[PDB]
Amino acid sequence: GSSGSSGLKGEPDCYALSLESSEQLTLEIPLNDSGSAGLGVSLKGNKSRETGTDLGIFIKSIIHGGAAFKDGRLRMNDQLIAVNGETLLGKSNHEAMETLRRSMSMEGNIRGMIQLVILRRSGPSSG
């Protein structure tokens, strides 16, 4: 490591260090007691007419006093770019949602947990 620079007179730019890019979070929810029935959360599908495709799947709302409640800390409208390592965007509203319950009973079986990969840009253009 160790490396830098000095000088520069003007700098045709405010500041550039690292290119910005959407962020991703990884939440782990155990399906030990919940798995029995399932996650315990509801999702909603969003369709786009501008594209004519399926934006994907997004959380609807976490049901407190439950299992997901723990992770409920999150907020609905959480696009599921994947789940348990399985992609969703590649699938449709049905399929996708069909995979969840799958991985929920599949991973929650041998594993007992489910991972949720969400994508949230840096900032929703605020300022």
* For the chain, domain boundaries: 22-121
CA atoms within 13 A on the CB side of 86: 18
Q: Identify the experimental approach.
A: NMR
- Residue 50 burial (C-beta neighbours within 10 Å; 0-12, 13-18, 19+): exposed
The CATH number, out of the four listed (3.40.50.2000, 3.40.50.1820, 3.40.50.740, 2.30.42.10), of the domain defined by the range 22-121: 2.30.42.10
